Each structure stands twice: as C-alpha cells, then as structure tokens.
Amino acid sequence: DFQETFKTSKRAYFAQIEKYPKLKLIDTFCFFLVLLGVIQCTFIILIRDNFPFNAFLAGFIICVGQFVLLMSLRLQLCNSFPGISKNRAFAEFIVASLILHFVCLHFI
Amino acid sequence: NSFYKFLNWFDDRTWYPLGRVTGGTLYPGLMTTSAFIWHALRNWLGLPIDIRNVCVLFAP
Amino acid sequence: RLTLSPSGNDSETQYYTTGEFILPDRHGVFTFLTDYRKIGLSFTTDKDVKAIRHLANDEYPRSWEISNSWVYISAICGVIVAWIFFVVSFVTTSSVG
Amino acid sequence: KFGIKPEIHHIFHAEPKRVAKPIAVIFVLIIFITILSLIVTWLNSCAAAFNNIPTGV
Numbered sequence: 098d099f100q101e102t103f104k105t106s107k108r109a110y111f112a113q114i115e116k117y118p119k120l121k122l123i124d125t126f127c128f129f130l131v132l133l134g135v136i137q138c139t140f141i142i143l144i145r146d147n148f149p150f151n152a153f154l155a156g157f158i159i160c161v162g163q164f165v166l167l168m169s170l171r172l173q174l175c176n177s178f179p180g181i182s183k184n185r186a187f188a189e190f191i192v193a194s195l196i197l198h199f200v201c202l203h204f205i
Numbered sequence: 206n207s208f209y210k211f212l213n214w215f216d217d218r219t220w221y222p223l224g225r226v227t228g229g230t231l232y233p234g235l236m237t238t239s240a241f242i243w244h245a246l247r248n249w250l251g252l253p254i255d256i257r258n259v260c261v262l263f264a265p
Numbered sequence: 266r267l268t269l270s271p272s273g274n275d276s277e278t279q280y281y282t283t284g285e286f287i288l289p290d291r292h293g294v295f296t297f298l299t300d301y302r303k304i305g306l307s308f309t310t311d312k313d314v315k316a317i318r319h320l321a322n323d324e325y326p327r328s329w330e331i332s333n334s335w336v337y338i339s340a341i342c343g344v345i346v347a348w349i350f351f352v353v354s355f356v357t358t359s360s361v362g
Numbered sequence: 363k364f365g366i367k368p369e370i371h372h373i374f375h376a377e378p379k380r381v382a383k384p385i386a387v388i389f390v391l392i393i394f395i396t397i398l399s400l401i402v403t404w405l406n407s408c409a410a411a412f413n414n415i416p417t418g419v
C-alpha cells in the first residue's frame with residue numbers, strides 16, 4: 098500500500114518540479130528556512146537559559162511566518178484563484194511580507 | 206506635553222504610599238485617537254476647540 | 266538608617282554629609298527626614314516627600330550589549346538579505362524554457 | 363525610647379546570568395556558513411538562471 102503511494106508520490110512530484118523552474122526555487126528557500134529554526138532552538142536546548150525571551154521569540158516567528166507566506170504563494174501560483182491573476186498574488190506577497198519584518202524588528 | 210512622556214508615566218497621586226504605574230496598567234487607543242482628532246482640528250481645518258468638548262462628543 | 270559624619274565648616278554653622286548612597290530597588294514615594302530629639306537640648310525636625318520612578322522604556326541594556334542574543338540578530342539579518350536576493354532573482358527568470 | 367538606634371542597610375537582588383561569549387561566536391559562524399550554502403545552492407541549479415532580463419525602455 099504505502100510503497101505504491103510512496104513511489105507514485107515521488108515520481109508525480111519530481112516531474113512537477115522538473116517542469117516548472119519556479120518551484121524548486123521556492124522549496125530550496127523553504128528547507129533552509131527550516132534549518133534556521135532548528136539550530137536556533139538547539140541553542141536554547143543546549144544551555145539551559147531563558148533570559149532574553151522576546152529576542153528568542155522574534156527570530157522563531159520570522160522563520161515560521163516567512164515559511165507560511167511561501168507556502169501560500171506556492172498554492173496560489175500553481176492553480177489560479179478565480180478573480181486573482183498572477184501579477185497580484187506577487188504584489189500581495191511583497192506587501193504582507195514587508196509588514197512582518199517591521200513588526201519583528203520592533204519586537205527585539 | 207509629548208507622546209513620549211505618556212507611554213511610561215508614573216503618577217504619585219493615586220494609591221499614595223505606593224503609586225501606580227500607568228503604562229503597564231491601561232489600554233491606550235481611546236486616548237490617542239482623541240489626541241489625534243484634537244491635533245487635526247486645531248492645525249489643519251482651522252478651528253480650535255477645547256479637549257473637554259472633544260471628549261464629550263466622542264461617541265455620537 | 267545611617268549615621269551622618271562631620272564635614273567642612275563655616276564660621277557659625279557645622280555641616281554634616283552622608284557621602285553617597287544608592288536608592289532602593291522599589292519605586293514609590295519616599296520621605297527624607299533627619300530629626301534630632303535629645304533630652305536636655307532643643308527639638309529640631311526637617312523633612313520632604315519625593316517620588317522615585319521606575320525605569321523608562323529606553324533606559325535598558327540594548328540587544329548588542331547582552332552577548333546572549335547575538336545569535337538571533339544573526340538569525341534576522343540572514344532572512345532579510347536572503348529575502349531580497351529571492352525577490353530580485355524571481356522576476357529575472359523564465360517559465361518552462 | 364530615646365537612646366541610639368542601630369544602623370541598617372538594604373539587600374539587592376542578583377542580576378540574571380549571562381552566558382560566556384566563546385559560544386555565541388561559534389553559532390554566528392554556523393549561520394554565516396548556512397546562508398552562503400543557500401546562495402551557492404541557488405546559483406548551482408537552474409533556479410537563478412538570469413535569462414529574461416528586461417532591457418529596453
């Protein structure tokens with residue numbers, strides 16, 4: 098069961114990546130936005146200390162929220178929403194990705 | 206006076222032997238839109254009115 | 266509570282100072298009195314009431330000076346410059362070439 | 363009721379503990395490795411293939 102769904106999903110995903118040269122750029126950005134959050138929590142687990150807690154929480158929020166806006170751009174960029182073009186999803190990505198950096202520079 | 210002297214304001218006329226610290230005990234937003242309407246009527250539209258009349262006629 | 270000590274004196278008076286002391290960890294209103302009630306001598310008092318503020322929101326050690334949050338500043342600058350190199354390298358490429 | 367009274371003082375609180383600086387230099391070094399790994403990996407594959415350059419007016 099899971100072998101068939103596994104190899105089916107690997108092949109049907111890798112063909113989709115090799116078709117469009119926009120998708121591997123998104124996913125290459127995404128994976129290293131996961132590794133930033135992982136080692137940034139590893140600093141907390143390594144030495145037991147919790148003192149500048151807001152400065153901990155700001156970078157972690159940058160990693161998670163910045164991951165999510167990429168996944169929304171990917172979902173909206175493969176299949177188009179009814180009424181929204183592909184020139185407007187990108188501008189909304191710029192504006193809403195540009196508010197979040199300011200409110201995570203005030204917070205540290 | 207300024208907006209910088211309001212966000213961190215220690216008043217010693219309430220709970221007297223141990224005064225309260227306001228900036229971490231109240232909700233700003235009802236005051237600062239009112240000071241904004243006062244600052245817009247006084248400097249731009251041309252007509253100066255008192256702060257008490259902006260505070261009374263703020264709900265209707 | 267702490268005992269005053271002799272200081273430089275003029276022709277008719279005699280001055281006493283307390284050097285320097287560091288104010289308390291608690292904020293509020295404080296009063297500063299030094300009375301001299303002694304039997305045989307006269308009675309003298311003097312006092313006043315002053316207010317001791319908490320810290321402001323600007324007077325704090327910043328995020329440079331702690332050396333415990335260099336890691337997170339380095340985990341903000343990378344996402345900023347990686348983001349701008351993302352956006353410039355997105356409108357200068359092709360589709361299914 | 364009218365003699366001398368003993369002098370006292372105050373007892374502060376201990377400051378929060380800072381961590382020693384020869385660890386934070388190591389971790390900002392690791393971040394400076396990972397970001398350059400990201401830029402090298404973009405320029406390695408077909409992703410950053412600068413080919414629709416908008417020259418003209």
Ligand SMILES: CCCCCCCCCCCCCC(=O)O[C@H](COC(=O)CCCCCCCCCC)COP(=O)(O)OCC[N+](C)(C)C
Pocket residue numbers: 206207208209237238240241244
């Ligand atoms: C898509 C993004 C959209 C962002 C929308 C931003 C809209 C905010 C516009 C605010 C304009 C303020 C203009 C202004 O300066 O008026 C002031 C100050 O007036 C005030 O007290 C109210 C302003 C407080 C600003 C609150 C922080 C910013 C919140 C929005 C980012 C009058 O207050 P006063 O009490 O008279 O004095 C203030 C201090 N001075 C230095 C000026 C002396």
